[PDB]
């Protein structure tokens, strides 16, 4: 089975962060949690749902209910901003959750500004078509991008950049949908949908 967790959780310093992992047989297992900061190795913060290894601050705790497990940070500090992964196992494998970025808020929240560009006539001469969805001025620095063509979710041909910091200290990212020229001509509506802090900002193109 797969373990899922929210891509983003954000709190202000001093608030309690709650990060929940879920999976079909997770309640039959022990869940553990890793903290990982950029360019660093993971660190075991909680194991057996609720136990801290030596050296882990007391503010880290854990619980479980049903087929979910939750990491809780009571009185969050700026140093706790990191990716957190849950981990358990199934019948044949070790399973990691997809990770949650905990942002400890240092500035106001900011929704993404989205711009969608069509393929250039120059590119279409090559039998290829790339749509470009640019995404700027968002904070916290995590988005999910979904593409639709004629209302149908696309599963193939997309790449999205890692978010990066702007000069104003907000974040930006871009996403690409690559199609054949012939697929581009066959469809009329194209949409880039960016989800941030539970709300979606959409831009579309229509022929």
């Amino acid at each position: 089975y797969e373990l899922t967790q929210p891509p983003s959780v954000s709190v202000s310093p001093g608030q309690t962060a709650s990060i929940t992992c879920s999976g079909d047989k997770l309640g039959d297992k022990y869940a553990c949690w890793y903290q990982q900061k950029p360019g660093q190795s993971p660190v075991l913060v909680i194991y057996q749902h609720s136990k801290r290894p030596s050296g882990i601050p007391e503010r880290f705790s854990g619980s479980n209910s049903g087929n979910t497990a939750t990491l809780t940070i009571s009185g969050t500090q700026a140093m706790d901003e990191a990716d957190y992964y849950c981990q358990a196992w199934d019948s044949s494998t070790v399973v990691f959750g997809g990770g949650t970025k905990l942002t400890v808020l240092g500035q106001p929240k900011s929704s993404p500004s989205v711009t969608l560009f069509p393929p250039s006539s120059e590119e279409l001469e090559t039998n290829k078509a790339t749509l470009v969805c640019t995404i700027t001025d968002f904070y916290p620095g995590v988005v999910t991008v979904d593409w639709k063509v004629d209302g149908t979710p696309v599963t193939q041909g997309m790449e999205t950049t890692q978010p990066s910091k702007q000069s104003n200290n907000k974040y930006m990212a871009s996403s690409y949908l690559t199609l054949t020229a012939r697929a581009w001509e066959r469809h009329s509506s194209y949409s880039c949908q960016v989800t941030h802090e539970g709300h979606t900002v959409e831009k579309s193109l229509s022929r």
Binding site: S41, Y47, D83, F96, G97, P119, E123, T136, Q162, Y176
Partner: protein, 217 residues
């Protein structure tokens, strides 16, 4: 204190092999299950393999079954990953880890010690010049420049030969179809363009590329 030191990462072609090593000290090595875990660029942790403390049991992620094998030499306190039939999608930082729980308890109590990571990068790409395309829409206006399908890094992008640097966002490269794609946008007042000229300048020295692309309606 408890320590794992990795080596053996490198840059190889698809289809080739590598051996990763993970040298252990500060604990009774033969009393602990050991794992490999990997992490692709910007992505999550992905389990690769485990070998039991006594070496009797080995298990693998479906993504590597038949291609990678895990082993340990308890006499040398060293864990290995033998990577064969490498693929582009195997590109990642590879970590080794030690389980907290000794002997039969190794699955239960987390991975308490991790290596520093060793990078494996698998690509058959050759030098390739970018194609440079205009980004234009169907009070202010946002234009851009798509730099598609170049290899290797580096590439540089400026606007109006560096004269226009305000309202510019140049995004990180991403790997697409085994080549790199980059884009940049520039936001200007709508009375400025197309009345005044906006040109993206792209330089890719590996391919002797210096391209100026004027952005038209």
């Amino acid at each position: 204190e408890v320590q794992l030191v990795e080596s053996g990462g490198g840059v190889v072609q698809p289809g080739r092999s590598l051996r990763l090593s993970c040298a252990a000290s500060g604990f009774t090595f033969s009393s602990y299950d050991m794992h490999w875990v990997r992490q692709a660029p910007g992505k999550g942790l992905e389990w690769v393999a485990v070998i039991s403390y006594d070496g009797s049991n080995k298990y693998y992620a479906d993504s590597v079954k038949g291609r990678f094998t895990i082993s340990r030499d308890n006499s040398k306190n060293t864990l290995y990953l033998h990577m064969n039939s490498l693929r582009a999608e195997d590109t990642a930082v590879y970590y080794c880890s030690k389980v907290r729980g000794a002997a039969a308890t190794g699955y239960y109590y987390g991975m308490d010690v991790w290596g520093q990571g060793t990078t494996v990068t698998v690509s058959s790409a050759k030098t390739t010049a970018p194609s440079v395309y205009p980004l234009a829409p169907v009070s202010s206006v946002t234009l851009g420049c798509l730099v598609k399908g170049y290899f290797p890094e580096p590439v540089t992008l400026t606007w109006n030969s560096g004269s226009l640097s305000s309202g510019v966002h140049t995004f990180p490269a991403v790997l697409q179809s085994d080549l790199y794609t980059l884009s940049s946008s520039v936001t200007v007042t709508s009375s400025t363009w197309p009345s005044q000229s906006i040109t993206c300048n792209v330089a890719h020295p590996a391919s002797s590329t210096k391209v100026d692309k004027k952005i038209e309606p």
